[PDB]
Design a protein around this motif. Structure first.
Motif, mmCIF file in Angstrom:
data_model
loop_
_atom_site.group_PDB
_atom_site.id
_atom_site.type_symbol
_atom_site.label_atom_id
_atom_site.label_comp_id
_atom_site.label_asym_id
_atom_site.label_seq_id
_atom_site.Cartn_x
_atom_site.Cartn_y
_atom_site.Cartn_z
ATOM 1 N N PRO A 35 38.899 51.308 40.451
ATOM 2 C CA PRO A 35 38.076 50.110 40.710
ATOM 3 C C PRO A 35 38.757 49.106 41.641
ATOM 4 O O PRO A 35 39.954 48.839 41.524
ATOM 5 C CB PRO A 35 37.865 49.544 39.303
ATOM 6 N N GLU A 36 37.962 48.495 42.546
ATOM 7 C CA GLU A 36 38.478 47.555 43.559
ATOM 8 C C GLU A 36 37.920 46.135 43.427
ATOM 9 O O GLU A 36 37.959 45.367 44.391
ATOM 10 C CB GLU A 36 38.190 48.097 44.964
ATOM 11 N N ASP A 37 37.373 45.787 42.285
ATOM 12 C CA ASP A 37 36.813 44.477 42.017
ATOM 13 C C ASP A 37 37.838 43.668 41.219
ATOM 14 O O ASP A 37 38.756 44.220 40.621
ATOM 15 C CB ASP A 37 35.504 44.617 41.225
ATOM 16 N N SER A 38 37.686 42.351 41.222
ATOM 17 C CA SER A 38 38.550 41.501 40.415
ATOM 18 C C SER A 38 37.845 40.174 40.200
ATOM 19 O O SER A 38 36.757 39.937 40.729
ATOM 20 C CB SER A 38 39.925 41.301 41.073
ATOM 21 N N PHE A 54 35.723 39.123 43.320
ATOM 22 C CA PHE A 54 36.278 39.729 44.539
ATOM 23 C C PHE A 54 35.890 41.195 44.684
ATOM 24 O O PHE A 54 36.134 41.988 43.771
ATOM 25 C CB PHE A 54 37.817 39.632 44.548
ATOM 26 N N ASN A 55 35.352 41.582 45.844
ATOM 27 C CA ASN A 55 34.934 42.973 46.083
ATOM 28 C C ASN A 55 35.899 43.597 47.087
ATOM 29 O O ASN A 55 35.913 43.215 48.267
ATOM 30 C CB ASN A 55 33.478 43.041 46.572
ATOM 31 N N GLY A 56 36.697 44.561 46.621
ATOM 32 C CA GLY A 56 37.590 45.290 47.507
ATOM 33 C C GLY A 56 37.034 46.615 48.023
ATOM 34 O O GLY A 56 36.159 47.227 47.421
ATOM 35 N N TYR A 57 37.545 47.049 49.169
ATOM 36 C CA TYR A 57 37.310 48.393 49.689
ATOM 37 C C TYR A 57 38.616 48.884 50.291
ATOM 38 O O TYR A 57 39.563 48.110 50.489
ATOM 39 C CB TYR A 57 36.178 48.437 50.736
ATOM 40 N N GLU A 342 28.428 51.404 43.192
ATOM 41 C CA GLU A 342 29.738 50.847 43.447
ATOM 42 C C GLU A 342 30.202 49.974 42.273
ATOM 43 O O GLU A 342 29.486 49.775 41.279
ATOM 44 C CB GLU A 342 29.689 50.082 44.764
ATOM 45 N N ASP A 343 31.443 49.489 42.388
ATOM 46 C CA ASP A 343 32.018 48.597 41.386
ATOM 47 C C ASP A 343 31.073 47.436 41.089
ATOM 48 O O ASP A 343 30.467 46.873 42.003
ATOM 49 C CB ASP A 343 33.363 48.085 41.898
ATOM 50 N N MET A 344 30.936 47.079 39.811
ATOM 51 C CA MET A 344 30.070 45.973 39.400
ATOM 52 C C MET A 344 30.885 44.905 38.663
ATOM 53 O O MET A 344 31.513 45.205 37.646
ATOM 54 C CB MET A 344 28.918 46.469 38.493
#
Ligand SMILES: Nc1ncnc2c1ncn2[C@@H]1O[C@H](COP(=O)(O)OP(=O)(O)OP(O)(O)=S)[C@@H](O)[C@H]1O
Ligand SMILES: [Mg+2]
Ligand SMILES: [Mg+2]
Ligand code: NI
Lengths: 378, 337
Positions: A35-38, A54-57, A342-344
C-alpha cells in the motif's frame, strides 16, 4: 529516528483504509502491491489541528517522506491559533517547498551514480543478451531505481480556532458537509489538478505548451494529476517526453493550492478527506457523476449506527470494496471497469454531528357518493 | 571436552560442562573446580537470531579476547555445549567474579567524593586504554560497571562495542546516558560519546539519582539542554527537523555546575564541566582527563594496547558467515595461567 512522534492524536476524527486489490480469474483470490497511502491527524499544543491524506505511486517512499517532513514543518511552532490568514498561506507554502526541495536533494547522489553506471554498459545492447561480467552493474542499477523512485499527491487541512484551511496538490479531495433542515449540503473545498481543470490549462499554456493537445491526451506518464510531490522522471526528465517537450518551466509543479478561511461557527456536520482510489472505485462501479454526494450519504448512515468515528470511516470503505467486487463479479455492463481498484484512504473529522444510536389515517382520492369510464393516456 | 550437565533457572536450561557448580544468578555465580575461587558465567541472550545480533555477538567475543587491563574484563574461559558448526547455537563467557554492581551499590549507599575520585580514575584508565585500541564501548551505565569489596573496578559488557569509523550504527546507548550527538546528528559521532556517559555516571555516583531520566528521545534532549544551555548556533548547523525541533523550545541559559550541585567537590565541578558539554571536539579525552587535578591523589602516569584488527567485520556477511567466524573464534581459545 523521528522528532514528531510524541505529538498527541486528534480526538475528534477517525480513519478507514484498505489496500489495493486485483481480482483473480481462477475464481476467488486477490493480489496486492504494498500500500502507498498514508494519513495523519495530530493536535499540537498551540491547540493547532493538522489533518492529511496522501496518495503514493511508484512505491511508497515519497508518501512516507512527505508525511514525516510536513509534520516537522508545521506542528513544531510554525503554526499558532492567532495567525492571520496571510500568515497561514505563507507558512503552508513554505512547508510544502521545503519538503519537495529536500526530497530532490535526498536522491541527487543516487541519480549521479546511476548515470555513471549506465554509461558502463554496451550501447544499445539488450541487457538480456549481456554476459556475466556486467551482472554486478545491473544488480546495482536495480537497487538504485528502488531508492529514487516514487511520487505522491497530498490533501491537507489546518484548523485554528474554528477557521478551516485546505492545501491541495493533486486529485485527493476535501468535502465540508453541513446539516440543514433540508439535509446534508456537500461542497468540495479544493479543485482537482488534472488536464480538465481550466486554470491548470492556462498555467500549462503559459509555459509554452498546447492547451488543446494537452487536454486531448489527458494523462501524463501514468497519472492524471498535473501537480505531484517528488517523482524524478517528471521533475527532471520532462524535456525528453514529447508534447511536453518544449516547456520553459517544469509542467508538473509541487506547489500547493490553498483554499482558506471557512468559518465554522454554528456549523453542524463533518469534514471528509479521501484519496483518489476511494472515489475512483465507486465511479468504476456506478458510473461518473455523484461520488462526493454518494460517499457523504454513506457516511451519514453509519453515523447513526457505529460507536466511533473510526468504525464510521471504515464501514464506508468496506461498503465501497464490496460494491466494486460485486460489480466485477456480476458480469454486467460495468464489470469491465472493475478488474482492480487502488489504495483507499478515508478520514472523517467531526464538527458536532451526532454519533450513536443513543443520540395515521389515509383519505381516499375522490370521496364516494351514494347515487362510461375512461383514463388519460400519457 | 568436559562432560556437560543441565540445570534450569528462571525457566531456561543451562548446559555447562562441570568445573563450575552451585549456580546462583543473564549471568550466575559459580565455583570452577579446576580453580578454587568463585566465578561469573555469562550466557549470551540470543546469539544468532538476526544478522545484527550475530555481528553484535561476534564482536563481544573478539574484543574481550583482545583487552588486557586490570580495569577491563577479559575472558578466562569460553565454551559451548554444541559439537560442531551445526549444533552451534549458544556461547558462554565466564569471568572472575566481583560480587557487586555499580547500579545496585548506588541503590542503597550514600557515597563520598574520595570513593568517586577513585572509581572514575579507574574508569578513565580503562577508557583511555580502550580508546587507544580503536574501539568504542557505546554503553556505559552503572548496570555494566563492576566493583570489588576494596572498591577495585573493571569495565563490563562489550555487547555494544565496535572498531570506530565515520559511518556507525545510529540507535545506540541507554537513554539517560546517550550523548546528544547520538540523536542530534545520526550515525556520525566518535568516541566522545563514551566520555559523556562517564560524566553522567560521575554525578550519579554522587547525588544518587539519574542525571537525565527522560522518557522518550525527545524528553531526553530537553533535559540535557536545560543544564548545558541551548546551542548558541555556533554548534548548531545537525540536520533539518533536528534544527526545527530545537528552535521550537525556549531559550535555556547554560549554567556553571557550581550553583548546580551544592556542597560539591569544586574539584569535580570543574571536571564535570569539562566533561559534559555539547561540542564534541572541544571536550576532554580520557587521557587529558586522566592526567587531571582531580586524580592527583592517585594519578601515576596508564598504558595503551595494540590496535584491533578489522578485515572481516567491516563487510556485508550473512547470518551464517557471522556465526561461523564466531565459532572459529570459540574453537581456537587459549586460557591464561
Ligand atoms: N564479572 C562479573 N562480576 C560481577 N557481576 C557481574 C559480572 N559480569 C556480570 N555481572 C552482573 O551481571 C549484570 C549484567 O552483566 P552484563 O555483562 O551487562 O550482561 P548483559 O548486559 O545482560 O549482556 P548484553 O546482552 O551484552 S547487554 C551486571 O549488572 C552485574 O550485576
Ligand atoms: Mg584501527
Ligand atoms: Mg548489561
Ligand atoms: Ni496509489
Amino acid at each position: 529516528p523521528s522528532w514528531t512522534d510524541d505529538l498527541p492524536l486528534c480526538h475528534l476524527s477517525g480513519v478507514g483504509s484498505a489496500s489495493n486489490r486485483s481480482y483473480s480469474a481462477d475464481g476467488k483470490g486477490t493480489e496486492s502491491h504494498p500500500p502507498e497511502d498514508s494519513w495523519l491527524k495530530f493536535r499540537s499544543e498551540n491547540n493547532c489541528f493538522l489533518y492529511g491524506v496522501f496518495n503514493g505511486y511508484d512505491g511508497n517512499r515519497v508518501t512516507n517522506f512527505v508525511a514525516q517532513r510536513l509534520s516537522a514543518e508545521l506542528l513544531l511552532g510554525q503554526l499558532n491559533a492567532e495567525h492571520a490568514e496571510a500568515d497561514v498561506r505563507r507558512v503552508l507554502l513554505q512547508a510544502f517547498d521545503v519538503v519537495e526541495r529536500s526530497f530532490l536533494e535526498s536522491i541527487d547522489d543516487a541519480l549521479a551514480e546511476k548515470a555513471s553506471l549506465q554509461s558502463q554498459l554496451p550501447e544499445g545492447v539488450p541487457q538480456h543478451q549481456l554476459p556475466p561480467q556486467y551482472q554486478k552493474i545491473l544488480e546495482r542499477l536495480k537497487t538504485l531505481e528502488r531508492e529514487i523512485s516514487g511520487g505522491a499527491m497530498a490533501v491537507v487541512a489546518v484548523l485554528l480556532n474554528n477557521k478551516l484551511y485546505v492545501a491541495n496538490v493533486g486529485t485527493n479531495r476535501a468535502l465540508l458537509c453541513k446539516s440543514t433542515v433540508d439535509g446534508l449540503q456537500v461542497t468540495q473545498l479544493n479543485v482537482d489538478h488534472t488536464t480538465e481543470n481550466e486554470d491548470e490549462l492556462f498555467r500549462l499554456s503559459q509555459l509554452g505548451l498546447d492547451a488543446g493537445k494537452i487536454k486531448q491526451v489527458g494523462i501524463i506518464c501514468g497519472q492524471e494529476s498535473t501537480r505531484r510531490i517528488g517523482d524524478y522522471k517528471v521533475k527532471y526528465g520532462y524535456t525528453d517526453i514529447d508534447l511536453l517537450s518544449a516547456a520553459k518551466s517544469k509542467p508538473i509543479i509541487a506547489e500547493p493550492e490553498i483554499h482558506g478561511a471557512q468559518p465554522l461557527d454554528g456549523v453542524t456536520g463533518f469534514l471528509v478527506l479521501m484519496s483518489e482510489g476511494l472515489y475512483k472505485a465507486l465511479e468504476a462501479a456506478h458510473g461518473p457523476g455523484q461520488a462526493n454526494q454518494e460517499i457523504a450519504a454513506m457516511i451519514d448512515t453509519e453515523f447513526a449506527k457505529q460507536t466511533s468515528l473510526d468504525a464510521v470511516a471504515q464501514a464506508v470503505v468496506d461498503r465501497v470494496k464490496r460494491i466494486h467486487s460485486d460489480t466485477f463479479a456480476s458480469g454486467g455492463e460495468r464489470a469491465r471497469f472493475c478488474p482492480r481498484h487502488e489504495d483507499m484512504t478515508l478520514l472523517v473529522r467531526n464538527f458536532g454531528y451526532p454519533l450513536g444510536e443513543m443520540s395515521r389515517v389515509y383519505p381516499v382520492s375522490v370521496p364516494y357518493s351514494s347515487a362510461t369510464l375512461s383514463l388519460v393516456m400519457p | 571436552r568436559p562432560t556437560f550437565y543441565r540445570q534450569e533457572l528462571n525457566k531456561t536450561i543451562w548446559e555447562v560442562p562441570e568445573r563450575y557448580q552451585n549456580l546462583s544468578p543473564s549471568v550466575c555465580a559459580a565455583f570452577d573446580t579446576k580453580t578454587g575461587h568463585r566465578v561469573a558465567v555469562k550466557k549470551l541472550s540470543r546469539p544468532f537470531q538476526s544478522i545484527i545480533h550475530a555481528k553484535r555477538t561476534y564482536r563481544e567475543l573478539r574484543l574481550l579476547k583482545h583487552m588486557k587491563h586490570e580495569n577491563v574484563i577479559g575472558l578466562l574461559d569460553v565454551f559451548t555445549p554444541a559439537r560442531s558448526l551445526e549444533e552451534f547455537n549458544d556461547v558462554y563467557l565466564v569471568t572472575h567474579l566481583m560480587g557487586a554492581d555499580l547500579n545496585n551499590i548506588v541503590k542503597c549507599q550514600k557515597l563520598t567524593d574520595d570513593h568517586v575520585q577513585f572509581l572514575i580514575y579507574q574508569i578513565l584508565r580503562g577508557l583511555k586504554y580502550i580508546h587507544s585500541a580503536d574501539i568504542i564501548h557505546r554503553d556505559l551505565k552503572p548496570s555494566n560497571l563492576a566493583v570489588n569489596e576494596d572498591c577495585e573496578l573493571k569495565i563490563l559488557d562489550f555487547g555494544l562495542a565496535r572498531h570506530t569509523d565515520d559511518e556507525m550504527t545510529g540507535y545506540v546507548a541507554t537513554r539517560w546516558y546517550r550523548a546528544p550527538e547520538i540523536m542530534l546528528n545520526w550515525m556520525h559521532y566518535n568516541q566522545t560519546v563514551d566520555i559523556w556517559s562517564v560524566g553522567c555516571i560521575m554525578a550519579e555516583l554522587l547525588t544518587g539519582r539519574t542525571l537525565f531520566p527522560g522518557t522518550d528521545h525527545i524528553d531526553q534532549l530537553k533535559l540535557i539542554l536545560r543544564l548545558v544551555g541551548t546551542p548558541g548556533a555556533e554548534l548548531l548547523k545537525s540536520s533539518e527537523s533536528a534544527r526545527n525541533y530545537i528552535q521550537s523550545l525556549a531559550q535555556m541559559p547554560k549554567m556553571n555546575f557550581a550553583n548546580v550541585f551544592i556542597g560539591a567537590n569544586p574539584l569535580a565541578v570543574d571536571l564535570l564541566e569539562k566533561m559534559l558539554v555539547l561540542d564534541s571536539d572541544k571536550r576532554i579525552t580520557a587521557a587529558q582527563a586522566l592526567a587531571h587535578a582531580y586524580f592527583a591523589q592517585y594519578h601515576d602516569p596508564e598504558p595503551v594496547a595494540d590496535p584491533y584488527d578489522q578485515s572481516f567485520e567491516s563487510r556485508d556477511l550473512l547470518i551464517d558467515e557471522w556465526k561461523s567466524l564466531t565459532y572459529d573464534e570459540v574453537i581456537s581459545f587459549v586460557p591464561p595461567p
